[PDB]
Amino acid sequence: EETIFSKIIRREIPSDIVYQDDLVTAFRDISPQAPTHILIIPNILIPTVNDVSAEHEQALGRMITVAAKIAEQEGIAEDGYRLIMNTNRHGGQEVYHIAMHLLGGRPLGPMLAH
Amino acid sequence: AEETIFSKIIRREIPSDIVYQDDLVTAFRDISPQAPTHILIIPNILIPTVNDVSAEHEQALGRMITVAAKIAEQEGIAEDGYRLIMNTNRHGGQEVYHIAMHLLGGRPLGPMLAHKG
Numbered sequence A: 001e002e003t004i005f006s007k008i009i010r011r012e013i014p015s016d017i018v019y020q021d022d023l024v025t026a027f028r029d030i031s032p033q034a035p036t037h038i039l040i041i042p043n044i045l046i047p048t049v050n051d052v053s054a055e056h057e058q059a060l061g062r063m064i065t066v067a068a069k070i071a072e073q074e075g076i077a078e079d080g081y082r083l084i085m086n087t088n089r090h091g092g093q094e095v096y097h098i099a100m101h102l103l104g105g106r107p108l109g110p111m112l113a114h
Numbered sequence B: 001a002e003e004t005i006f007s008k009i010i011r012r013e014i015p016s017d018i019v020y021q022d023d024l025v026t027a028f029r030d031i032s033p034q035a036p037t038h039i040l041i042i043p044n045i046l047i048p049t050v051n052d053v054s055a056e057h058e059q060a061l062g063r064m065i066t067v068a069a070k071i072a073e074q075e076g077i078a079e080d081g082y083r084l085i086m087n088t089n090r091h092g093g094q095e096v097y098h099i100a101m102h103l104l105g106g107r108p109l110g111p112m113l114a115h116k117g
Ligand SMILES: Nc1nc2c(ncn2[C@@H]2O[C@H](COP(=O)(O)O)[C@@H](O)[C@H]2O)c(=O)[nH]1
Pocket: A004, A008, A015, A016, A027, A028, A029, A030, A031, A032, A039, A085, A086, A092, A093, A094, A095, A096, A097, A099
C-alpha cells in the first residue's frame, strides 16, 4: 500500500526536497500550517507508528536529527519549533506513511486546542 | 547545561511512578495532562534541546518512538490513534530543558496546530 510519499521519495512526483539520505527524505508540506512546515519521512514504507520495531530505530532517530539540521538552516532553531507525528483517526493521520512535521517561524503553541 | 528534575526521575533519586525504563529511555505521566493519555518519553542522558542532538543520539531518539508505540498499545489507544509531540525553545513553548516526547491520546485530538496561521 504505497502512498504518494514513495513517489515523492523516488522523484516521480514533484516536491521541494530539502534533504535526503539513505534512511530519510525531507520535503516542504504542500499545505503548510506555519511559516516553516517540512515533512521528514523514512525512505521505507512504514504505514503507521504502530508498525515500527527495533530495526527501524536508526531511521527513526535520523528523522529527528535531520529535523534539527533543517530547523538550523531554516533560521528557526533559536526562536524554536515543534515536531509532530500523527497516528490513525485520533491523531488525524491523513497519509499512511509515517511522517514527522517540523513547524516553526512564529510562536506556535498550544500543543492542543483547548 | 545543568540537569532538570527529570534526571532525578530517571535515576530514581526522587519519588516517582515510572511507566517504562530501559538502557536508553524513561517514560512517566505528565504532571499536567493535556489528554486522557499524556505520557513523557525522555532519553536517559541530558540533551537540553532538540538543537543539541547528534548522530550518536540516533538510537536513543528512535527508541523514544518505538517505546511511545509500545506504551500507546499498552494504554489501549494504538488503534484509535495518538500524537507524538516535541517542543523546542520559546516558539515551541518548551518548559523543561531536557528533551521530551509527549505521547497524547485517548480522544480525538483536534487540529495538529490550534493556532493555524
Ligand atoms: N508535498 C506534498 N505534501 C503532501 C502530499 N500529500 C500530503 N502532504 C502533506 O503531508 C501531510 C500528511 O501527513 P499526515 O497527515 O499523514 O500526518 C499533510 O499535512 C499534507 O499537507 C503530497 O503529495 N505532496
